[PDB]
Point group: C3
Chain length 670, copies 3
Amino acid sequence: VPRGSAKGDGVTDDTAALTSALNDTPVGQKINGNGKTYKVTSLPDISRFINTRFVYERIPGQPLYYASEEFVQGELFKITDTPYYNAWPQDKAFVYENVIYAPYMGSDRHGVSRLHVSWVKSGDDGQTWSTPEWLTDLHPDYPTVNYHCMSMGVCRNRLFAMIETRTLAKNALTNCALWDRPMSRSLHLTGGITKAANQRYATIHVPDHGLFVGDFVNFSNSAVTGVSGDMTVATVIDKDNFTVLTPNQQTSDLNNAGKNWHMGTSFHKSPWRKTDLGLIPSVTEVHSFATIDNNGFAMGYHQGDVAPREVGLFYFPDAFNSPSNYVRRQIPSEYEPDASEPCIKYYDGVLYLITRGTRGDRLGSSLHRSRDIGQTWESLRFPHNVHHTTLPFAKVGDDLIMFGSERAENEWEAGAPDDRYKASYPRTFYARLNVNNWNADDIEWVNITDQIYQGGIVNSGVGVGSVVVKDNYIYYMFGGEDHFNPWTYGDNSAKDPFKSDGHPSDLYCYKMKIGPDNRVSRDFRYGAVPNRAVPVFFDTNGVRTVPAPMEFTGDLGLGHVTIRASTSSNIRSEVLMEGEYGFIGKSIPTDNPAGQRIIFCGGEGTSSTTGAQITLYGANNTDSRRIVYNGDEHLFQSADVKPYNDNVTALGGPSNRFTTAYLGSNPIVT
Amino acid sequence: VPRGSAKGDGVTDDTAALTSALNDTPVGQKINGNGKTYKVTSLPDISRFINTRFVYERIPGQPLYYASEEFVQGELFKITDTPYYNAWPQDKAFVYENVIYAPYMGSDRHGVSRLHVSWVKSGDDGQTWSTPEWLTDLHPDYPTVNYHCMSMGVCRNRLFAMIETRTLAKNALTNCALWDRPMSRSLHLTGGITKAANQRYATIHVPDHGLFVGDFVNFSNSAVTGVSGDMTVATVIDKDNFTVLTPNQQTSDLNNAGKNWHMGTSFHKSPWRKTDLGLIPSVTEVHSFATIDNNGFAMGYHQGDVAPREVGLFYFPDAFNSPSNYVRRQIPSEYEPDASEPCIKYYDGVLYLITRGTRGDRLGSSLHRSRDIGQTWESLRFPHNVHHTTLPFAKVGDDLIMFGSERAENEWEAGAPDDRYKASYPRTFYARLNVNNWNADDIEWVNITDQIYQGGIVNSGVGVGSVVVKDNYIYYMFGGEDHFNPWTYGDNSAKDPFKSDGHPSDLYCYKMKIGPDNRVSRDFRYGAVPNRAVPVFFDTNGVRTVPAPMEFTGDLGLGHVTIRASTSSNIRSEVLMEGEYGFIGKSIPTDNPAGQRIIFCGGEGTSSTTGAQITLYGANNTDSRRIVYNGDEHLFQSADVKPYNDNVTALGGPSNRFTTAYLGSNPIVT
Amino acid sequence: VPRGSAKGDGVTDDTAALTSALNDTPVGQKINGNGKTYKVTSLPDISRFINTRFVYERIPGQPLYYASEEFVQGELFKITDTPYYNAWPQDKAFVYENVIYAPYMGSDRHGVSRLHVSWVKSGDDGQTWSTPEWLTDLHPDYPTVNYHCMSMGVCRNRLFAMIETRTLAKNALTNCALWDRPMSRSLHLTGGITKAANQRYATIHVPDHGLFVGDFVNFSNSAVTGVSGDMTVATVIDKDNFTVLTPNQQTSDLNNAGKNWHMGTSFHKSPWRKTDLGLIPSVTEVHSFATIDNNGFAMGYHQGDVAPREVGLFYFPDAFNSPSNYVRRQIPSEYEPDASEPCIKYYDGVLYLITRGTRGDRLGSSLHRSRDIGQTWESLRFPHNVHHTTLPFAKVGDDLIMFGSERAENEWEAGAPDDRYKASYPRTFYARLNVNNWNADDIEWVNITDQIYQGGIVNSGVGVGSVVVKDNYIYYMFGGEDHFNPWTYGDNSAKDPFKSDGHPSDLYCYKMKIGPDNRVSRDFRYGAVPNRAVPVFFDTNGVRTVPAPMEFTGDLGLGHVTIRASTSSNIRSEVLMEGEYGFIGKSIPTDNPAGQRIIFCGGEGTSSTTGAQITLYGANNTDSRRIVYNGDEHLFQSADVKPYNDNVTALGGPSNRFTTAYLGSNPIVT
Ligand SMILES: CC(=O)N[C@H]1[C@H]([C@H](O)[C@H](O)CO)O[C@](O)(C(=O)O)C[C@@H]1O
């Protein structure tokens, strides 16, 4: 009886052949699939294969693809590890001047409670990521409302973001504002600075500077008197020229033509420009960002609270001069039902838009392209009701490369019921779509990594991510959970991130190679002590030392404390108390309440021999509310020594007489 | 002359063939051993092989096996990195509701000094581990005695642990107590809550709840008035039903049948139940834990201080109703000499027990099985005097899979002398034993990873671990050192963990695949800033901010300090001082002792123009122990202004006269 | 038409064959180059190859070699991650008693501003590295001058370092000092301690102890009365014997011959010996270290500020007895132009020296060997003007194995212009040179890893490293940057490390296998919470607890603060203030300045019912600079109650009368 070998044609049922191969080969052998796709009736032991793809219909009629290691040149990274509920990179990621930015929201729930719009960044092409930065504070009217953001990107050297205000109670949109800020840059320039004689302003030529009046500018080596150090923009002449006010003037014209100098700019030292757009009607969320040109950009949106749904974009044609001016452009009406959260990108005059489907039992994600920034469209529906996921994407060559994640295991397929309230391993997929062929009928979703959905609450932080390309690599930044319960049902219904393991949602990044890498590897194993967040150095005395300024806002318990000399050429140690008032007090002692007191001393020890003392006795002290003032001089300066009340308290007593009183006149008795 | 190729039959001496292969192949080629075992006279360059096992008799007559990479599908992880002496997972590990727990003891030595029973946990199937948690405090009678634990596990949703009290002086057992606590869970339930009219209690049906009166229970969406939020168990009706006291009552019966709601429970908000077992006679250590059924469990023990040794278990048949009731069951007398620290597990009605051997020159580790919870046994001796290691294990199919580690290099073999006081690379092994065949004569110990033994002291934290299975993976959690000396012989005889590199012992986990993995990989490279232990966020001002509450118990030196508004709707900044009393004092200045003082000020600056001041002058000040009180009013409220002593001190002086005294009557002179 | 396959002979142009292979093979296939070298006209997609080397002439006539993964058995690690400018391991690395030391300088720039000579260490053969330790403090005359070090190593159990003093203004050398300190060790010894009757000193025989009078020595189990615990060296008899002063004496001689005991020594508890060498004439930098024998060592140097350059070494023949005595030895004059920073090592009576070339357009790095410690030399010039890099190296068998790094991409080659002020990926290379053949004409520089040069400033921290061998592995410790701009041109011209991402330079280590590894792998994935720098434990109350002493020197903002009982058998909480004086004050309130005050209280709350209070009112308070003293007794001890000034202020007032005054005599009125 002849045996069949594995065909790897994606049609022949290769299950038997693969089973025999696995049974007959040592467990440590890496079975090479030669880049082929093997149809199977169940997924085999995938870990024993390299360079293999499986096609499997978990639900009959719905083939999906599954990658062994090395089939794709790619790798998953964990990029945040914070107790906040860290999720929703959707759809904010971007690359600027070699740095990859992964913005997200860190909250305590699916909502705006405790929420900061945040980012982490990578300065090494995704191998390592920075300490989280808060981009927004808690709203001034917290806890009624707080901020929210799902649209962010860069246009002409400025960060632009749709900063929404939403209620804590219902996550209801109350306000939309466009916030923008110059990105930090160093510029190494030749010429371009002029300063007319007998006046104090200098004109700086920097093409497409993206700065506004009041923005930070720093100068080095200008060779133009007074154009030096930290300055600010005084005027903007046009998109390529601005002026600064110098502190001085010269009798001759200055011009640094042919001379090399340095600028830069600063995100942190420049204010946000905030443009109030009010409550934009018929909007649930603003989501995703497509830079159009040197003047403006589009942001996606949907309305999904009331029938009928809208999905589309807002185009801001000139966000620099007119940040309040935008035009609403909807996708075709047939694609709007059961749709939300469109991802938009612009390539070579084509605006591409991909929707999120809201139901597994109705037509789902659809793709649209426009050559007139959303006025007219060509459209396609993905087969099998793609739902619950956004599909962020980039265009590489003729392909859109899109990523998505089911929110819990076995939810991807059409007709698949939601599967919440239990731990599972949701699948993350990518797919390619050739824009010339414009047909998604035969799309191949390839499962490249699995995440964890914790199951302690109905909500999932898995997925809902964002995509960027840098060089020859594509990056999908997205959420994933772990098995640590937030104890919402349990001892942490208040959702305090700092109890137990906080919230399991954190960010991941799938880094996938999309073109040739013509350099030797930059990869390293990280073996360092992470020393950015709380920088520690063992000092020459052998004691851990943190030289960075820090803020501890949570309740602190301290042991023995020494306040070191720090202030005014280190002449003094200093504690400053804020608020309307400060309070320094004494707890009720647990074991000896009869001793309750604080001793304040001008010297080193509890013995009054070491310095003048004032001792405030607690109410619980045997000598209740006593004060003892103990010094070798008691000198009352600048004011009379008075009783608080009139004719109620005395000087001295029968058993505490003053020897005498030294007076400049007889007592005034009345 | 014909040449022989490598046979890979474990009997032919393949040394020559492998040497020739290595000499004739590029160093970067991975030489595939095709899953075979190759006999060699010395270990070759193992790093150049994949999928290869070597058999080598370092000591003639004692073959051991050595795995190249990829021979086993497995990986070593480092899971703690703490300055404490972190060792002894033995034998406490368990899996509960998808989380892997690795309990251990963190001390400063082989003993109970500075010791906390601790754990770390993994919520991602062993890829990453949590910040250590202390499960015990220092004993109330520290430093005479402290806690110790080598037996811990879960029975009916409760953690049970044998918490021992031992002397610091000699590590002598003084007390045994069974401590237990409900495990934290979220339950998503339908129906089961009833509340009779005109009374305030509700009955909660939760099968096998494992709760006692006083334990924490939280309710959400109960649809039963008053059964809501954080509550406690009022009564326990039976193993499946308990009651809670609500704050109210209704005129009709309530019953949430068919309605979906949520409970949970809390380890942290429930107290330990502590059952004092006294000093159990003839016990040195309680070690290892086997859940038997829904009612109870067994714990291993040995007595090894005096002849004769005992080894066996204590069976607690009903730990819920009768935690103080247990029965002692010994292994057969012939297996008790030179034996300790049995590992026990229960599978399909069979209790398996494996001993630690104490001597390399006497019969060592033995294996035992019982179908009557230790009343009768079948037994086997491992060949070659296995010693110094516990052999934690799990049963997978027909095999016991056991792990062990020599404590320093070249100690494993029978007759091998101890090799301490020098750095080395001890071997960790695993083996399989088929329970049907019940013969260890041909057992194959496979060296899968090597650890470091530091050598600065005789003791070793290497090994003495614990084993669990989760899904298709087995996990061996165990100790390992590094080359950093604790300086016990040196400048740290006190064994302070926070000097230099502290103690080199830390925990590792070998994760080994034991069955098919039918999902795409979950593996990631960790690229995040670890931000759980000290959660830091760069605030909108660019300053590192820690929002978590924290306790700093070690001596602190601080620079410039600002106490921010924090308390009573943020109206005030607040410092509270604990103890019987607080002391705020002033060090003797190094450079200008003549200035020693503290200035207390109601305003922002050292100038008295900014606020009222009191200045306490030190004894070293030129104006020794002076006090200057400087305000625009001095108002003495609630009491007379008196001298401390009678007729000793005056009001004013010849050069410090008060202008007059305003009195309601003439001075009383006596 | 026949097609040619890849020849892999390093001469045939294999570009076409490799292109066809890549086009015809699945992207996930690892193409095995079989350890051969393939000539190409451009680098192909290197990531798709294993065990392959390419030879490529980026600049015609200058072949360089490029390694795919697995061609070399090696791996890159990141070993620091700190906000300081971390660079210049050159040339200080060493191995001592199983620990790998990577010393470097952490500053804020190419200069001595904010600089500490620092190290990180590995106790696991390079897998993980320690928290940075500061070896030097800021110079006493900072900010005029500060320390600097590029030469460090070990001779007879002592660390020796050339600690330079340089100006912040120009990095100009002002002073050279030899600093030395005993290395920490534990010794397990038999016999050697004698103590003569009727006197208090004991003689300790420890061969080559390397200790001086005053150095720390600790004793355990000596079996010699009074030789116990922490002690110090009283006298040094000779290189093998020293004495200690015990606290007691006995009537009989003591001698612990045949008895096992323990010493050790301590780097941290012993002072530096500092030998001032003054401003050594004709020196720019001292760099690199070669241990010669049991008595001394050589250090490299160059002079490069003025013509003519010098390059050579200083030999200290007896650094123990005569640390101030050294001899200057130059390399041959023809090799001194355009040369600096020599690396020196000593093997089997041969001193090897390799220079750094300073120009790509002039003859570059050269290699020299001497059998008389630099009096005579044999020399060789590396082809193609190797420049901008030091070439640290070790000798393994007949080969020198050297490492170097271009400082920015495409600078390595002869004639290549500097390429700064833009981000790039500089190449790191190694090469072997057979010392018997003594010809570098055909040297093969192999690119094994690429780093990042950030480009925000002209300077680069890439490279300038150090090399050590431990066992069968060689380690190159060196600098690398990331894409995070330091904002020198921008908002951080002051170069504060603790703003934003600080400085991008950090240390890396390339670990390369250089001989057989005859043990099973020690490798692990690091999955622990790093818990050495700021050791955190969740206490039994669920709160993060740090038990280590710590120093916070940066400005701190604190929220609610509790000072716990800590001092004098935990009777009191304690705050001590340093400096000439302490200041506790109150900020001007933002919202209610009219309330500005501090309430000091002997009790737990703001209500005076809880304890005695003194309230200091701010100048901004409605009751400006008021003081209210509120207690149930006001007792003035040890001194008269006086006004500060004479006959200016009163006791009481018309609306604040004291009831009376209790006096021992009539008022003295004048
Ligand atoms: C915060 C604060 O100022 N507390 C003060 C209170 C309030 O002024 C009072 O309760 C009205 O609210 O009264 C005093 O107790 C008092 O009269 O003895 C002292 C105390 O310092």
